[PDB]
TrEMBL record, chain E:
<comment type="similarity">
    <text>Belongs to the reoviridae RNA-directed RNA polymerase family.</text>
</comment>
<protein>
    <recommendedName>
        <fullName>RNA-directed RNA polymerase</fullName>
    </recommendedName>
</protein>
């Protein structure tokens, strides 16, 4: 509770969301994979 | 890409009732009317001439 | 359609012209019926008279063709 | 003998079954390559631009 | 029609505590996203008109998943 | 003779797809490119003549485009 | 969608087997259902298709199976 | 009914695609995508409770959904 | 860049002349019969089916490889790096065995 | 308390200089391929990661 | 022989597989410790405040 | 004004794609 004072959010994994950067990172890796064969 | 070569090696298939001497006689027929080779020969001659 | 699909305004003007001509005729429906094929006959049916390049997909029709089994191969450069 | 104990018993059987399947696949490619492909290449060769 | 109206009013004015059992069951499952897939077709091959880079999301979904290359009637005939 | 060879190279189980009054004929490209358009034109004239003596009016289109069930394809792209 | 059902919705966690992600042997139909959930999650998001791995089931596989069977029996009333 | 959202619960805009499924499936999908943001938004607005939930932690969803009419809309969409 | 299109043209010609057709469904049908238990963490059949779909489903390197036999004087066809395991692999990993 | 900061300073100096860095995903990737049966109560691969 | 009877055979197989995985891990750390780390320490040592 | 083209619209997006 006091550890990670208020960002505790008991669940460790699965707490990620979709907001912005995940989309862009997926695009970058996808385009790299396309360009490297 | 090897991973396509293996697929090609593993999944070849013929038409059900194949008679090769007929299939090729049909397929090749038109491709031996073209005159590209004969023009090429004259081109090589002119190259050596020049 | 123009605002939703980003149509070229120049073509939309031609469409409006056709609609107006239909209105100014003796019968709107008859006019539309008799002139329904200008856009196809002038764009789709007369396309690529002189071809420069591009890609065309490589598809294969397997057996039995009764099964409608097609498999995708790749792209072939045009000429 | 020094790799098998790391795998469960069922997985070994599945692996061997899959390998047997792959060995006896009815792929028509190899005999095509052995018998017909050379003929096709021979037919094509003189008409190449290069 | 009055039956319609009163039923909808009854549904709206009421207060609830949960979704259907199926959805409550579904929410118990959580996943983990990972690296992107591999391209299914070439990125510069036109397949459906309008589905192009100016129409990003459909274009990306189509090139990531790939078009359905087999007719649906026969596919669901065996289901 | 070109028309004879073409017709003898075509069968319905390989080349013709029909549904009601709408049908499509596929001419497989030869190893030397694509079939000469003049031969296709004379064949089309033959079908047009053949339709009349049993009272069928064959509406035939040959413009380098594929249409089936009001779906339009050009160079492998559906419009 | 078929190939994406088959080879892009992994029902095993990437880091290895977890305690809750175990399917009871005679409840194999859950393998069919969870594929749809993975498909919905991957397709709803904007962008490219993404390989997805199962992470965790809160109540464990057995509890989910019991809830599903309860719904299956109670419907049609 | 299958129409995607644009931006809600403080999330980023245009993060959903209309390949969203309909009915319970799409609902579950978008909740799964934005569950953490939804929880933080819900807590920050005073919708706080003490009974920890497997899905929403300590968020008082049972009343926020009722007042946001989300339960009501979900249930009347099936009439 | 100069030579590759020649090989591509020869490949399409060979495709158009050959009676052979590539039908990947053979592998799916034959693997649809292998016996396995559902309680296993690993499944050889599912993995191998997953690994046989080429990137972009190009299926064209075969005809190109056949065409290359005529020009080994100037062109040496090789297998790309991407087909090898990234870190060299390990025989304990089934994925690497399939590779 | 007097010596511990010195060790921290040397540690960060080594950070700035070493070519070696850790990727923890190695362990997870290796353990992802361990063969085991889902009916078992105990999972060594899960326990070692934990 | 007096400890394995308490365990299921499949569990034993999984344990052996996990140990084999751990033994053959491709960790580059021991090489770094054997070959380069002493060089780094030798370089750093003269410049220490202590 | 600024009715530049549609082909350049297509190409500009692609150029955005290729960049990495």
């Amino acid at each position: 509770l006091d550890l990670d004072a208020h960002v505790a959010s008991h669940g460790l994994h699965g707490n990620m969301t979709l907001t912005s950067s995940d989309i862009q990172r997926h695009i970058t890796e996808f385009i790299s994979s396309w360009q490297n064969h | 890409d090897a991973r396509a070569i293996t697929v090609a090696l593993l999944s070849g298939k013929y038409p059900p009732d194949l008679v090769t001497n007929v299939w090729y006689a049909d397929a090749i027929y038109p491709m031996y009317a073209d005159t590209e080779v004969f023009s090429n020969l004259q081109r090589d001659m002119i190259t050596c001439e020049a | 359609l123009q605002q939703t699909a980003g149509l070229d305004p120049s073509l939309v003007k031609l469409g409006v012209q056709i609609c107006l001509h239909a209105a100014a005729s003796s019968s709107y429906a008859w006019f539309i019926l008799k002139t329904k094929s200008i856009f196809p006959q002038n764009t789709l049916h007369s396309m690529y008279e002189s071809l420069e390049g591009g890609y065309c997909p490589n598809l294969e029709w397997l057996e039995p063709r009764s099964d409608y089994k097609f498999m995708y191969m790749g792209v072939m450069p045009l000429s | 003998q020094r790799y098998q104990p790391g795998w469960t018993q069922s997985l070994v059987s599945s692996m061997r079954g899959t390998l047997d399947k792959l060995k006896l696949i009815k792929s028509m490619t190899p005999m095509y390559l052995q018998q017909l492909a050379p003929v096709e290449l021979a037919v094509i060769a003189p008409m190449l631009p290069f | 029609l009055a039956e319609m109206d009163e039923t909808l009013m009854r549904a709206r004015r009421h207060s609830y505590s949960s979704f259907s059992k199926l959805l409550e069951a579904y929410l118990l499952v959580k996943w983990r996203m990972c690296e992107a897939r591999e391209p299914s077709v070439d990125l510069r091959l036109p397949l459906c008109a309008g589905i192009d880079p100016l129409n990003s999301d459909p274009f990306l979904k189509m090139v990531s998943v790939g078009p359905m290359l087999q007719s649906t009637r026969k596919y669901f005939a065996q289901t | 003779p070109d028309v004879l060879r073409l017709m003898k190279s075509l069968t319905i189980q390989r080349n013709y797809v029909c549904q009601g009054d709408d049908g499509l004929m596929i001419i497989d490209g030869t190893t030397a490119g694509k079939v000469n358009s003049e031969t296709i034109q004379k064949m089309l004239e033959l079908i047009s003549k053949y339709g009349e003596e049993f009272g069928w009016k064959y509406d035939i289109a040959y413009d380098g485009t594929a249409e089936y069930l009001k779906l339009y394809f050009i160079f492998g792209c559906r419009i | 969608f078929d190939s994406m059902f088959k080879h892009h919705v992994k029902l095993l966690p990437k880091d290895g087997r977890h305690l809750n992600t175990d399917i009871p042997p005679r409840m194999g139909w859950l393998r069919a259902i969870l594929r749809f959930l993975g498909a919905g999650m991957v397709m709803t998001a904007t962008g490219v298709a993404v390989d997805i791995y199962l992470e965790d089931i809160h109540g464990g596989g057995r509890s989910l199976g019991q809830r599903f069977m309860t719904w299956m029996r109670q419907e049609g009333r | 009914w299958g129409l995607p959202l644009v931006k809600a619960f403080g999330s980023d805009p245009w993060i959903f695609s209309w390949y969203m499924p309909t009915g319970d499936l799409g609902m579950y999908s978008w909740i799964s995508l934005i569950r953490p943001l939804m929880t933080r938004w819900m807590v920050a607005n005073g919708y706080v409770t003490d009974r920890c939930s497997p899905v929403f932690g300590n968020a008082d969803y049972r009343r926020c959904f009722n007042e946001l009419k989300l339960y009501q809309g979900y249930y009347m969409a099936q009439l | 860049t100069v030579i590759q299109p020649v090989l591509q043209d020869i490949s399409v010609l060979l495709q158009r002349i050959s009676p052979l057709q590539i039908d990947p469904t053979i592998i799916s049908n034959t693997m649809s019969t292998v016996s396995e238990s559902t309680t296993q963490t690993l499944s050889p059949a599912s993995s191998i089916l997953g690994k046989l779909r080429p990137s972009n489903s190009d299926f064209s390197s075969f005809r190109v490889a056949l065409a290359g036999w005529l020009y080994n004087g100037v062109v040496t066809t090789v297998i790309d790096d991407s087909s090898y395991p990234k870190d060299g692999g390990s025989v304990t990993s089934l994925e690497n065995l399939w590779d």
